[model samples]
Target: ATFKVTLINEAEGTKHEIEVPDDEYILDAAEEQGYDLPFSCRAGACSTCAGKLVSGTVDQSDQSFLDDDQIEAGYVLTCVAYPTSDVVIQTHKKEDLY
Candidate 1:
Protein backbone atom coordinates (compact mmCIF):
# COMPACT_ATOMS: atom_id res chain seq x y z
CA ALA A 1 0.00 0.00 0.00
CA THR A 2 1.08 3.57 -0.56
CA PHE A 3 1.19 6.07 2.30
CA LYS A 4 1.85 9.78 2.34
CA VAL A 5 4.43 10.75 4.97
CA THR A 6 5.04 14.27 6.12
CA LEU A 7 8.14 14.83 8.24
CA ILE A 8 9.03 18.09 9.86
CA ASN A 9 12.48 18.89 11.16
CA GLU A 10 12.04 21.34 13.98
CA ALA A 11 15.71 22.06 14.19
CA GLU A 12 16.10 23.02 10.57
CA GLY A 13 12.62 24.38 10.04
CA THR A 14 12.24 22.06 7.09
CA LYS A 15 9.50 19.74 6.00
CA HIS A 16 9.66 16.61 3.83
CA GLU A 17 6.90 14.75 2.12
CA ILE A 18 7.39 11.34 0.59
CA GLU A 19 5.45 8.35 -0.56
CA VAL A 20 6.26 5.25 1.49
CA PRO A 21 5.60 1.60 0.90
CA ASP A 22 4.16 -0.56 3.63
CA ASP A 23 7.37 -2.48 4.04
CA GLU A 24 9.69 0.48 4.07
CA TYR A 25 10.99 2.07 7.23
CA ILE A 26 10.25 5.80 7.41
CA LEU A 27 13.85 6.84 8.01
CA ASP A 28 15.21 4.78 5.15
CA ALA A 29 12.50 5.96 2.81
CA ALA A 30 13.17 9.60 3.63
CA GLU A 31 16.89 9.14 3.34
CA GLU A 32 16.53 7.48 -0.03
CA GLN A 33 14.81 10.61 -1.21
CA GLY A 34 17.72 12.77 0.00
CA TYR A 35 16.16 14.05 3.20
CA ASP A 36 18.91 14.36 5.81
CA LEU A 37 16.89 13.14 8.74
CA PRO A 38 18.46 12.29 12.07
CA PHE A 39 19.20 8.72 13.11
CA SER A 40 21.58 6.58 15.09
CA CYS A 41 21.48 2.83 15.74
CA ARG A 42 18.87 2.34 13.05
CA ALA A 43 17.83 -0.89 14.70
CA GLY A 44 15.72 1.13 17.14
CA ALA A 45 18.06 0.80 20.10
CA CYS A 46 18.58 4.54 20.38
CA SER A 47 16.51 7.67 20.53
CA THR A 48 18.43 9.62 17.94
CA CYS A 49 15.82 8.88 15.33
CA ALA A 50 12.97 9.77 17.66
CA GLY A 51 9.96 11.68 16.41
CA LYS A 52 6.32 12.28 17.25
CA LEU A 53 3.39 11.12 15.18
CA VAL A 54 1.10 14.05 14.64
CA SER A 55 -1.40 11.84 12.83
CA GLY A 56 -2.03 8.25 11.73
CA THR A 57 -0.55 5.01 13.00
CA VAL A 58 2.60 2.98 12.40
CA ASP A 59 3.82 -0.54 13.04
CA GLN A 60 6.09 0.21 15.96
CA SER A 61 6.31 -3.28 17.37
CA ASP A 62 9.91 -3.74 16.28
CA GLN A 63 10.94 -0.80 18.39
CA SER A 64 11.54 -2.27 21.83
CA PHE A 65 12.66 0.66 23.89
CA LEU A 66 9.64 2.86 24.20
CA ASP A 67 7.11 2.27 26.95
CA ASP A 68 3.36 2.23 26.63
CA ASP A 69 3.03 5.80 27.81
CA GLN A 70 5.49 7.08 25.26
CA ILE A 71 3.88 5.12 22.47
CA GLU A 72 0.48 6.35 23.48
CA ALA A 73 1.88 9.84 23.56
CA GLY A 74 2.85 9.53 19.88
CA TYR A 75 6.59 9.11 20.27
CA VAL A 76 8.15 6.83 17.67
CA LEU A 77 11.53 5.55 16.68
CA THR A 78 11.44 6.52 13.05
CA CYS A 79 14.27 4.17 12.13
CA VAL A 80 12.08 1.16 12.77
CA ALA A 81 8.59 2.55 12.26
CA TYR A 82 6.58 1.36 9.28
CA PRO A 83 3.49 3.26 8.25
CA THR A 84 0.13 1.62 8.62
CA SER A 85 -1.67 4.68 7.26
CA ASP A 86 -0.96 8.13 5.92
CA VAL A 87 1.16 9.84 8.58
CA VAL A 88 2.21 13.31 9.57
CA ILE A 89 5.21 13.41 11.90
CA GLN A 90 7.58 15.89 13.36
CA THR A 91 11.27 15.03 13.58
CA HIS A 92 13.75 16.29 16.16
CA LYS A 93 11.14 15.58 18.76
CA LYS A 94 11.88 15.43 22.45
CA GLU A 95 10.77 12.27 24.16
CA ASP A 96 12.10 9.86 26.72
CA LEU A 97 11.83 6.84 24.44
CA TYR A 98 15.11 5.44 25.63
Candidate 2:
Protein backbone atom coordinates (compact mmCIF):
# COMPACT_ATOMS: atom_id res chain seq x y z
CA ALA A 1 0.00 0.00 0.00
CA THR A 2 1.07 3.59 -0.43
CA PHE A 3 1.79 5.36 2.85
CA LYS A 4 1.83 8.94 3.96
CA VAL A 5 5.29 10.33 4.73
CA THR A 6 5.89 13.59 6.50
CA LEU A 7 9.46 14.89 6.35
CA ILE A 8 10.72 17.73 8.50
CA ASN A 9 13.97 19.10 7.17
CA GLU A 10 15.83 20.92 9.91
CA ALA A 11 18.36 22.63 7.65
CA GLU A 12 15.73 23.92 5.28
CA GLY A 13 13.33 24.31 8.18
CA THR A 14 10.62 22.89 6.04
CA LYS A 15 8.04 20.16 6.32
CA HIS A 16 6.66 18.23 3.39
CA GLU A 17 4.08 15.54 3.01
CA ILE A 18 4.86 12.82 0.52
CA GLU A 19 3.27 9.57 -0.48
CA VAL A 20 5.52 6.55 -0.76
CA PRO A 21 4.71 3.02 -1.68
CA ASP A 22 5.55 0.20 0.66
CA ASP A 23 7.69 -1.37 -2.07
CA GLU A 24 9.46 1.81 -3.17
CA TYR A 25 12.48 3.60 -1.73
CA ILE A 26 11.37 6.71 0.18
CA LEU A 27 14.02 9.01 -1.28
CA ASP A 28 13.39 8.12 -4.88
CA ALA A 29 9.65 8.26 -4.51
CA ALA A 30 9.95 11.59 -2.76
CA GLU A 31 12.02 13.02 -5.59
CA GLU A 32 9.57 11.80 -8.18
CA GLN A 33 6.91 13.80 -6.38
CA GLY A 34 9.10 16.92 -6.70
CA TYR A 35 10.69 16.92 -3.30
CA ASP A 36 14.47 17.28 -3.11
CA LEU A 37 15.65 15.08 -0.27
CA PRO A 38 19.22 14.47 0.75
CA PHE A 39 21.02 11.33 -0.34
CA SER A 40 24.41 9.78 -1.07
CA CYS A 41 25.59 6.21 -1.56
CA ARG A 42 22.01 5.31 -2.50
CA ALA A 43 22.84 1.71 -1.66
CA GLY A 44 22.37 2.46 2.04
CA ALA A 45 26.09 2.29 2.90
CA CYS A 46 26.17 5.91 4.07
CA SER A 47 24.31 8.34 6.30
CA THR A 48 23.75 11.19 3.91
CA CYS A 49 20.04 10.62 3.71
CA ALA A 50 19.44 9.67 7.30
CA GLY A 51 16.32 10.80 9.09
CA LYS A 52 15.02 10.69 12.62
CA LEU A 53 12.00 8.45 12.86
CA VAL A 54 9.61 10.51 14.85
CA SER A 55 6.70 8.24 14.09
CA GLY A 56 5.62 5.12 12.19
CA THR A 57 7.57 2.16 10.78
CA VAL A 58 9.71 1.42 7.72
CA ASP A 59 11.52 -1.46 6.05
CA GLN A 60 15.14 -0.52 5.73
CA SER A 61 16.39 -4.01 5.13
CA ASP A 62 19.39 -3.58 2.87
CA GLN A 63 22.15 -4.33 5.38
CA SER A 64 22.48 -0.70 6.28
CA PHE A 65 25.05 1.29 8.20
CA LEU A 66 22.60 1.72 11.05
CA ASP A 67 22.70 -1.20 13.44
CA ASP A 68 19.90 -2.74 15.44
CA ASP A 69 20.52 -0.22 18.20
CA GLN A 70 20.26 2.75 15.85
CA ILE A 71 16.97 1.57 14.47
CA GLU A 72 15.77 1.20 18.02
CA ALA A 73 16.91 4.75 18.56
CA GLY A 74 14.58 5.80 15.71
CA TYR A 75 17.14 6.45 12.98
CA VAL A 76 16.29 5.61 9.37
CA LEU A 77 18.08 5.78 6.03
CA THR A 78 15.76 7.37 3.48
CA CYS A 79 17.76 5.96 0.57
CA VAL A 80 16.78 2.46 1.58
CA ALA A 81 13.79 3.13 3.77
CA TYR A 82 10.47 1.83 2.54
CA PRO A 83 7.48 2.85 4.59
CA THR A 84 5.39 0.11 6.07
CA SER A 85 3.06 2.63 7.73
CA ASP A 86 2.35 6.33 7.88
CA VAL A 87 5.65 8.00 8.82
CA VAL A 88 6.90 11.28 10.20
CA ILE A 89 10.65 11.85 10.02
CA GLN A 90 13.15 14.62 10.53
CA THR A 91 15.51 14.85 7.57
CA HIS A 92 19.25 15.46 7.55
CA LYS A 93 19.56 14.53 11.17
CA LYS A 94 22.28 11.93 10.85
CA GLU A 95 24.88 14.11 12.49
CA ASP A 96 23.58 13.28 15.94
CA LEU A 97 23.38 9.58 15.19
CA TYR A 98 26.95 9.30 13.96
Candidate 3:
Protein backbone atom coordinates (compact mmCIF):
# COMPACT_ATOMS: atom_id res chain seq x y z
CA ALA A 1 0.00 0.00 0.00
CA THR A 2 0.96 3.64 -0.32
CA PHE A 3 1.22 6.05 2.52
CA LYS A 4 0.97 9.82 2.40
CA VAL A 5 4.17 11.35 3.68
CA THR A 6 4.72 14.86 4.91
CA LEU A 7 8.40 15.56 5.42
CA ILE A 8 9.24 18.71 7.30
CA ASN A 9 12.93 19.01 6.70
CA GLU A 10 14.61 21.51 8.96
CA ALA A 11 17.71 21.18 6.85
CA GLU A 12 15.88 22.16 3.68
CA GLY A 13 13.76 24.57 5.67
CA THR A 14 10.82 23.34 3.67
CA LYS A 15 8.01 20.86 3.81
CA HIS A 16 7.50 18.39 1.04
CA GLU A 17 4.60 15.99 0.57
CA ILE A 18 4.62 12.79 -1.40
CA GLU A 19 3.22 9.27 -1.53
CA VAL A 20 5.55 6.44 -0.76
CA PRO A 21 4.87 2.77 -0.95
CA ASP A 22 4.94 0.91 2.31
CA ASP A 23 8.05 -0.98 1.27
CA GLU A 24 10.05 1.81 -0.33
CA TYR A 25 12.54 3.88 1.57
CA ILE A 26 11.23 7.34 2.40
CA LEU A 27 14.40 8.98 1.11
CA ASP A 28 14.31 7.01 -2.10
CA ALA A 29 10.71 7.97 -2.65
CA ALA A 30 11.55 11.60 -1.95
CA GLU A 31 14.37 11.51 -4.44
CA GLU A 32 12.03 10.26 -7.13
CA GLN A 33 10.00 13.37 -6.46
CA GLY A 34 13.08 15.54 -7.06
CA TYR A 35 13.66 16.63 -3.53
CA ASP A 36 17.26 16.98 -2.30
CA LEU A 37 16.81 15.91 1.28
CA PRO A 38 19.56 15.44 3.80
CA PHE A 39 21.37 12.14 3.43
CA SER A 40 24.75 10.49 3.70
CA CYS A 41 25.29 6.72 3.57
CA ARG A 42 21.89 6.10 1.98
CA ALA A 43 21.60 3.16 4.32
CA GLY A 44 20.14 2.39 7.72
CA ALA A 45 23.45 2.55 9.56
CA CYS A 46 24.10 6.26 9.13
CA SER A 47 22.29 8.83 11.19
CA THR A 48 22.87 11.56 8.60
CA CYS A 49 19.49 10.84 7.08
CA ALA A 50 17.88 11.19 10.43
CA GLY A 51 14.43 12.66 11.01
CA LYS A 52 11.88 12.69 13.77
CA LEU A 53 8.66 10.78 13.48
CA VAL A 54 6.58 13.67 14.58
CA SER A 55 3.21 12.08 13.88
CA GLY A 56 3.41 8.63 12.46
CA THR A 57 4.56 5.10 12.84
CA VAL A 58 7.05 3.52 10.48
CA ASP A 59 9.28 0.52 10.20
CA GLN A 60 13.01 0.83 9.70
CA SER A 61 14.10 -2.77 10.22
CA ASP A 62 17.46 -1.15 9.78
CA GLN A 63 19.72 0.98 11.98
CA SER A 64 23.03 1.11 13.79
CA PHE A 65 23.83 4.57 15.14
CA LEU A 66 20.37 4.96 16.62
CA ASP A 67 19.93 3.47 20.05
CA ASP A 68 16.78 2.16 21.71
CA ASP A 69 16.17 5.47 23.41
CA GLN A 70 16.41 7.41 20.17
CA ILE A 71 14.27 4.87 18.37
CA GLU A 72 11.56 5.12 20.96
CA ALA A 73 11.90 8.88 20.87
CA GLY A 74 10.92 9.01 17.19
CA TYR A 75 14.37 9.25 15.63
CA VAL A 76 14.38 7.72 12.18
CA LEU A 77 16.77 7.27 9.32
CA THR A 78 14.73 8.19 6.27
CA CYS A 79 16.95 6.07 4.10
CA VAL A 80 15.50 3.01 5.74
CA ALA A 81 12.11 4.26 6.85
CA TYR A 82 9.12 2.66 5.30
CA PRO A 83 5.93 4.27 6.44
CA THR A 84 3.31 1.93 7.77
CA SER A 85 0.82 4.76 7.90
CA ASP A 86 0.58 8.40 6.89
CA VAL A 87 3.79 9.97 8.12
CA VAL A 88 4.51 13.45 9.36
CA ILE A 89 8.24 13.77 9.99
CA GLN A 90 10.54 16.58 11.07
CA THR A 91 14.22 16.56 10.29
CA HIS A 92 16.76 16.74 13.07
CA LYS A 93 18.50 19.69 11.48
CA LYS A 94 20.83 20.21 14.38
CA GLU A 95 21.27 16.99 16.30
CA ASP A 96 19.31 14.63 18.49
CA LEU A 97 17.66 15.30 21.81
CA TYR A 98 18.01 12.52 24.40
Candidate 4:
Protein backbone atom coordinates (compact mmCIF):
# COMPACT_ATOMS: atom_id res chain seq x y z
CA ALA A 1 0.00 0.00 0.00
CA THR A 2 1.00 3.59 -0.43
CA PHE A 3 1.40 5.88 2.55
CA LYS A 4 1.92 9.58 2.90
CA VAL A 5 4.62 10.33 5.43
CA THR A 6 5.87 13.61 6.81
CA LEU A 7 9.27 13.48 8.51
CA ILE A 8 10.24 16.39 10.70
CA ASN A 9 13.78 16.91 11.99
CA GLU A 10 13.41 19.47 14.74
CA ALA A 11 17.12 19.86 15.52
CA GLU A 12 17.85 20.81 11.94
CA GLY A 13 14.55 22.45 11.13
CA THR A 14 14.05 20.08 8.22
CA LYS A 15 10.95 18.31 7.01
CA HIS A 16 10.33 15.76 4.31
CA GLU A 17 7.01 14.57 3.04
CA ILE A 18 6.89 11.55 0.81
CA GLU A 19 4.93 8.58 -0.34
CA VAL A 20 6.22 5.26 0.97
CA PRO A 21 5.58 1.68 0.02
CA ASP A 22 4.61 -0.93 2.56
CA ASP A 23 7.36 -3.27 1.44
CA GLU A 24 9.93 -0.67 2.41
CA TYR A 25 11.12 0.65 5.74
CA ILE A 26 10.66 4.36 6.49
CA LEU A 27 14.36 5.04 6.96
CA ASP A 28 15.45 3.37 3.74
CA ALA A 29 12.65 4.99 1.82
CA ALA A 30 13.65 8.36 3.16
CA GLU A 31 17.31 7.77 2.42
CA GLU A 32 16.53 6.57 -1.08
CA GLN A 33 14.91 9.88 -1.68
CA GLY A 34 17.93 11.71 -0.26
CA TYR A 35 16.71 12.37 3.27
CA ASP A 36 19.47 11.53 5.76
CA LEU A 37 17.48 10.29 8.74
CA PRO A 38 19.38 9.26 11.86
CA PHE A 39 20.14 5.58 12.23
CA SER A 40 22.83 3.19 13.47
CA CYS A 41 21.61 -0.40 13.44
CA ARG A 42 19.45 -1.02 10.44
CA ALA A 43 18.43 -4.27 12.10
CA GLY A 44 16.14 -2.49 14.57
CA ALA A 45 18.29 -3.08 17.63
CA CYS A 46 19.24 0.53 18.39
CA SER A 47 17.68 3.87 19.29
CA THR A 48 19.48 6.00 16.75
CA CYS A 49 16.50 5.80 14.50
CA ALA A 50 14.11 6.84 17.24
CA GLY A 51 11.41 9.36 16.49
CA LYS A 52 7.89 10.23 17.52
CA LEU A 53 4.81 9.51 15.50
CA VAL A 54 3.05 12.81 15.66
CA SER A 55 0.09 11.45 13.73
CA GLY A 56 -1.12 8.23 12.09
CA THR A 57 -0.27 4.58 12.60
CA VAL A 58 2.67 2.30 11.88
CA ASP A 59 3.52 -1.35 12.35
CA GLN A 60 6.40 -1.40 14.82
CA SER A 61 5.79 -4.67 16.59
CA ASP A 62 9.16 -6.16 15.68
CA GLN A 63 11.29 -3.19 16.57
CA SER A 64 13.62 -3.96 19.50
CA PHE A 65 14.48 -0.76 21.33
CA LEU A 66 11.02 0.43 22.27
CA ASP A 67 8.74 -1.17 24.84
CA ASP A 68 4.97 -1.38 24.65
CA ASP A 69 4.62 1.76 26.76
CA GLN A 70 6.99 3.67 24.55
CA ILE A 71 5.31 2.43 21.40
CA GLU A 72 1.95 3.40 22.78
CA ALA A 73 3.44 6.77 23.56
CA GLY A 74 4.18 7.25 19.82
CA TYR A 75 7.93 6.62 19.90
CA VAL A 76 9.30 4.45 17.11
CA LEU A 77 12.47 3.32 15.43
CA THR A 78 12.08 4.64 11.95
CA CYS A 79 14.50 1.97 10.78
CA VAL A 80 11.80 -0.61 11.21
CA ALA A 81 8.62 1.43 11.21
CA TYR A 82 6.29 0.70 8.34
CA PRO A 83 3.40 3.01 7.74
CA THR A 84 -0.05 1.62 8.24
CA SER A 85 -1.57 4.93 7.22
CA ASP A 86 -0.51 8.48 6.48
CA VAL A 87 2.10 9.48 9.05
CA VAL A 88 3.67 12.55 10.57
CA ILE A 89 6.93 11.85 12.43
CA GLN A 90 9.16 14.13 14.44
CA THR A 91 12.80 13.04 14.55
CA HIS A 92 15.63 13.61 17.03
CA LYS A 93 12.99 14.41 19.60
CA LYS A 94 13.49 11.50 21.93
CA GLU A 95 17.07 10.87 22.97
CA ASP A 96 15.79 9.13 26.05
CA LEU A 97 14.66 6.22 23.94
CA TYR A 98 18.22 5.04 23.67
Candidate 5:
Protein backbone atom coordinates (compact mmCIF):
# COMPACT_ATOMS: atom_id res chain seq x y z
CA ALA A 1 0.00 0.00 0.00
CA THR A 2 1.16 3.57 -0.64
CA PHE A 3 1.99 5.70 2.38
CA LYS A 4 2.26 9.38 3.19
CA VAL A 5 5.58 10.78 4.44
CA THR A 6 6.39 13.95 6.23
CA LEU A 7 9.93 15.25 5.87
CA ILE A 8 10.83 17.75 8.53
CA ASN A 9 13.95 19.83 9.03
CA GLU A 10 14.97 19.74 12.65
CA ALA A 11 16.75 23.08 12.56
CA GLU A 12 14.00 25.35 11.28
CA GLY A 13 10.89 23.21 11.58
CA THR A 14 10.05 23.29 7.92
CA LYS A 15 7.83 20.47 6.71
CA HIS A 16 6.91 18.84 3.43
CA GLU A 17 4.59 16.05 2.47
CA ILE A 18 5.52 13.42 -0.04
CA GLU A 19 4.09 10.24 -1.43
CA VAL A 20 5.99 7.24 -2.71
CA PRO A 21 5.32 3.88 -4.21
CA ASP A 22 5.31 1.04 -1.73
CA ASP A 23 8.56 -0.25 -3.15
CA GLU A 24 10.32 3.02 -3.94
CA TYR A 25 13.48 4.15 -2.19
CA ILE A 26 13.15 7.03 0.25
CA LEU A 27 15.63 9.09 -1.77
CA ASP A 28 13.57 8.61 -4.87
CA ALA A 29 10.50 9.55 -2.89
CA ALA A 30 12.10 12.77 -1.73
CA GLU A 31 13.03 13.61 -5.28
CA GLU A 32 9.52 12.76 -6.40
CA GLN A 33 8.40 15.46 -3.97
CA GLY A 34 11.08 17.97 -4.98
CA TYR A 35 13.16 17.85 -1.81
CA ASP A 36 16.79 18.77 -2.37
CA LEU A 37 18.40 16.00 -0.36
CA PRO A 38 22.16 16.24 -0.62
CA PHE A 39 24.40 13.38 -1.59
CA SER A 40 27.32 12.37 -3.79
CA CYS A 41 26.42 8.72 -4.08
CA ARG A 42 23.05 7.12 -4.57
CA ALA A 43 24.35 3.64 -3.77
CA GLY A 44 24.40 4.30 0.01
CA ALA A 45 28.19 4.12 0.29
CA CYS A 46 28.52 7.61 1.76
CA SER A 47 26.76 9.10 4.78
CA THR A 48 26.08 12.31 2.91
CA CYS A 49 22.41 11.39 2.55
CA ALA A 50 22.00 10.44 6.17
CA GLY A 51 18.88 11.64 7.98
CA LYS A 52 17.21 10.69 11.21
CA LEU A 53 13.91 8.89 11.53
CA VAL A 54 12.15 10.82 14.21
CA SER A 55 8.84 9.07 14.47
CA GLY A 56 7.97 6.07 12.31
CA THR A 57 9.87 3.07 11.05
CA VAL A 58 11.33 2.25 7.63
CA ASP A 59 12.43 -1.05 6.21
CA GLN A 60 15.97 -0.75 4.95
CA SER A 61 16.16 -1.77 1.36
CA ASP A 62 19.57 -3.17 2.26
CA GLN A 63 20.65 -3.87 5.83
CA SER A 64 24.26 -3.62 4.73
CA PHE A 65 23.70 0.04 4.01
CA LEU A 66 23.77 1.06 7.67
CA ASP A 67 25.27 -0.10 10.91
CA ASP A 68 23.51 -1.10 14.13
CA ASP A 69 24.37 2.10 15.98
CA GLN A 70 23.03 4.24 13.20
CA ILE A 71 19.86 2.23 13.08
CA GLU A 72 19.38 2.49 16.83
CA ALA A 73 19.80 6.23 16.60
CA GLY A 74 17.27 6.41 13.77
CA TYR A 75 19.94 7.40 11.25
CA VAL A 76 19.11 6.16 7.80
CA LEU A 77 20.56 6.73 4.38
CA THR A 78 17.43 8.03 2.73
CA CYS A 79 18.92 6.70 -0.49
CA VAL A 80 17.93 3.13 0.23
CA ALA A 81 15.16 3.50 2.75
CA TYR A 82 11.61 2.30 2.25
CA PRO A 83 8.83 3.53 4.46
CA THR A 84 6.86 0.77 6.07
CA SER A 85 4.39 3.26 7.48
CA ASP A 86 3.72 6.95 7.52
CA VAL A 87 7.07 8.39 8.63
CA VAL A 88 8.30 11.56 10.19
CA ILE A 89 11.89 12.22 9.16
CA GLN A 90 13.96 14.79 11.01
CA THR A 91 16.82 16.20 9.01
CA HIS A 92 19.39 18.93 9.63
CA LYS A 93 18.81 20.97 6.49
CA LYS A 94 16.45 23.88 7.13
CA GLU A 95 15.59 27.12 5.40
CA ASP A 96 13.82 30.23 6.59
CA LEU A 97 11.53 32.19 4.35
CA TYR A 98 11.75 35.42 6.29
Candidate 6:
Protein backbone atom coordinates (compact mmCIF):
# COMPACT_ATOMS: atom_id res chain seq x y z
CA ALA A 1 0.00 0.00 0.00
CA THR A 2 1.00 3.61 -0.54
CA PHE A 3 0.93 6.22 2.17
CA LYS A 4 0.43 9.97 1.95
CA VAL A 5 2.89 12.46 3.32
CA THR A 6 2.80 16.24 3.36
CA LEU A 7 5.78 18.51 3.56
CA ILE A 8 5.18 22.07 4.61
CA ASN A 9 8.00 24.44 3.87
CA GLU A 10 7.97 27.16 6.45
CA ALA A 11 10.32 29.23 4.32
CA GLU A 12 8.00 29.34 1.37
CA GLY A 13 4.74 28.80 3.19
CA THR A 14 3.96 26.02 0.79
CA LYS A 15 2.64 22.52 1.24
CA HIS A 16 2.78 19.47 -0.95
CA GLU A 17 1.36 15.98 -0.85
CA ILE A 18 3.55 13.11 -1.89
CA GLU A 19 2.44 9.54 -2.41
CA VAL A 20 5.05 7.15 -1.19
CA PRO A 21 5.56 3.45 -1.11
CA ASP A 22 4.70 2.21 2.33
CA ASP A 23 8.12 0.69 2.80
CA GLU A 24 10.00 3.74 1.52
CA TYR A 25 11.71 6.10 3.85
CA ILE A 26 10.15 9.54 4.28
CA LEU A 27 13.27 11.23 2.94
CA ASP A 28 13.07 9.23 -0.22
CA ALA A 29 9.51 10.32 -0.72
CA ALA A 30 10.38 13.97 -0.29
CA GLU A 31 13.29 13.69 -2.67
CA GLU A 32 11.14 11.88 -5.20
CA GLN A 33 8.59 14.63 -5.04
CA GLY A 34 11.15 17.23 -6.20
CA TYR A 35 11.20 19.19 -3.00
CA ASP A 36 14.53 20.87 -2.35
CA LEU A 37 15.11 19.40 1.07
CA PRO A 38 18.81 19.88 1.44
CA PHE A 39 20.97 17.01 2.57
CA SER A 40 24.34 15.49 1.98
CA CYS A 41 24.45 12.13 3.69
CA ARG A 42 21.25 10.25 3.23
CA ALA A 43 22.27 8.42 6.37
CA GLY A 44 21.09 9.80 9.68
CA ALA A 45 24.35 11.58 10.46
CA CYS A 46 23.84 15.03 9.00
CA SER A 47 21.52 17.76 10.21
CA THR A 48 21.16 18.96 6.63
CA CYS A 49 18.05 16.86 6.39
CA ALA A 50 16.70 17.69 9.79
CA GLY A 51 13.01 18.54 9.99
CA LYS A 52 10.37 18.97 12.64
CA LEU A 53 7.46 16.61 12.85
CA VAL A 54 4.61 19.01 13.36
CA SER A 55 2.07 16.21 13.42
CA GLY A 56 1.67 12.50 12.93
CA THR A 57 4.21 9.81 13.74
CA VAL A 58 7.16 8.05 12.13
CA ASP A 59 9.71 5.40 12.87
CA GLN A 60 13.11 6.99 13.31
CA SER A 61 15.25 4.32 11.75
CA ASP A 62 18.24 6.06 13.21
CA GLN A 63 18.35 8.38 16.20
CA SER A 64 21.88 9.65 15.92
CA PHE A 65 21.06 13.28 15.17
CA LEU A 66 18.27 13.92 17.69
CA ASP A 67 18.19 13.48 21.43
CA ASP A 68 15.22 11.97 23.23
CA ASP A 69 13.86 15.36 24.14
CA GLN A 70 14.31 16.60 20.62
CA ILE A 71 12.43 13.62 19.33
CA GLU A 72 9.66 14.30 21.80
CA ALA A 73 9.79 17.89 20.63
CA GLY A 74 9.33 16.60 17.07
CA TYR A 75 12.84 16.86 15.59
CA VAL A 76 13.47 14.11 13.09
CA LEU A 77 16.28 13.18 10.74
CA THR A 78 14.39 12.97 7.50
CA CYS A 79 16.98 10.76 5.87
CA VAL A 80 16.04 7.69 7.85
CA ALA A 81 12.43 8.28 8.68
CA TYR A 82 9.57 6.02 7.71
CA PRO A 83 6.05 7.11 8.37
CA THR A 84 4.05 5.03 10.81
CA SER A 85 0.98 6.66 9.32
CA ASP A 86 -0.01 9.78 7.43
CA VAL A 87 2.17 12.67 8.54
CA VAL A 88 2.47 16.44 8.34
CA ILE A 89 6.03 17.71 8.59
CA GLN A 90 7.56 21.12 8.94
CA THR A 91 11.06 21.53 7.60
CA HIS A 92 13.14 23.34 10.14
CA LYS A 93 14.02 26.90 9.27
CA LYS A 94 17.67 27.12 8.28
CA GLU A 95 18.17 30.48 9.91
CA ASP A 96 16.78 29.43 13.25
CA LEU A 97 18.25 25.96 13.73
CA TYR A 98 21.43 25.93 11.69
Better of 3 and 4 by TM-score: 4
Tell me the RMSD of model 3 versus the true structure. 1.9
Task: Report the lDDT tens digits of candidate 2 across residue range 59-89.
Answer: 8888469888988999999999889999999
Instruction: Give the whole-model CA lDDT for all candidates, comma-separated.
Output: 0.88, 0.88, 0.83, 0.85, 0.75, 0.78
| Candidate 2 backbone collisions, by pair | none
Give lDDT tens digits, candidate 5, residues 1-98: 88888888766778999987779988897886788877667787767777788788898857465667667878877888889988888764212100
Give the residue spans of candidate 2 off by over 4 A.
none
Candidate 5 overall lDDT versus native: 0.75
TM-score of each: 0.91, 0.93, 0.88, 0.91, 0.84, 0.86
Candidate 6: how many backbone clashes? 0
Query: Which one wins on TM-score?
Result: 2
lDDT of 1 by residue, 4-91 (tens): 9999877788877999999999988999988877877889777888999889999988998788898889999999999999999999
Ranking by lDDT: 2, 1, 4, 3, 6, 5
lDDT of 3 by residue, 1-98 (tens): 99999989665578889999988989899999997778888767777788888898998888677889888888888888889999999975426743
True-vs-predicted CA distance for residue 95, candidate 6, Å: 5.3
TM-score of 5: 0.84
Better of 2 and 6 by TM-score: 2
Using TM-score as the measure, name the better of candidate 3 and candidate 6: 3
Off by over 4 Å in 1: 94-98
lDDT of 4 by residue, 17-89 (tens): 9889987789888998888877787877888888898899988767887778888888988898889999999
